[PDB]
Design a protein around this ligand. Sequence first.
Ligand code: E1F
Ligand code: ZN
Length: 258
Amino acid sequence: HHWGYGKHNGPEHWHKDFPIAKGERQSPVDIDTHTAKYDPSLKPLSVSYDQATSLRILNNGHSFKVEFDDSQDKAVLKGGPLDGTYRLTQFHFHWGSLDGQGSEHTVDKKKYAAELHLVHWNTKYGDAGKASQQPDGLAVLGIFLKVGSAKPGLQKVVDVLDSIKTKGKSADFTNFDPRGLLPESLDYWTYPGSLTTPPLNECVTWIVLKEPISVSSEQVLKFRKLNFNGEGEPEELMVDNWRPAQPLKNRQIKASFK
Ligand SMILES: NS(=O)(=O)c1ccc(C(=O)CSc2ncccn2)cc1Cl
Ligand SMILES: [Zn+2]
């Protein structure tokens, strides 16, 4: 009876296996735009993805993820609220059954159709597992998706999803450039938080971009054809794989803009 997004194993159940679910710095959160404080000391975010090396794409029964070669300084995040250099290790998405839900973070209670998470680890900790045990171990760049015009840079991802329909399928996935998933502006909100999936470790500096990307209905339709289940099990479409907003508690959200 493992964790998921259903009625009997979804977010309201996760605290039983992972008591940190009720912790002091859980994610996602609602970003109340009027309450976030503009911090003039925040630096521009530096996103250096020119030498990224994608390796593989995998349906793990919770999402799909593109994994990168993170064994050298390739695709790195720095600046912004961060101290030091963070290596990109994977990206994945969360999305809805309908376009009015799917994001994890919300902005003045607005839900987007999906959210992209680009997961990076602090190189001072040597590997992603070690980094996950530190309060400043990971940095996730979060990008909202709205439905409208297509994102051309996402098409290579959506076109291979039919090859990883069910849980446990993977494929080779080289030469994918994550720069094609970014909006024009790198203005952001930031706060200290957690993984949004089990094990829910409190190790993430969240950097959530203010500007969404647009993707087409046909692109998000292909996300919704994935399956949570393994092949041969009853078919349950992979939709609504998002954790709702959690209590902000004793945290401030800072804005890089305004
Ligand atoms: N949604 S999210 O918060 O961006 C997110 C989701 C899953 C993972 C994983 O690495 C899960 S496996 C794992 N995590 C920490 C320690 C041992 N294993 C990492 C992140 Cl940052
Ligand atoms: Zn995520």
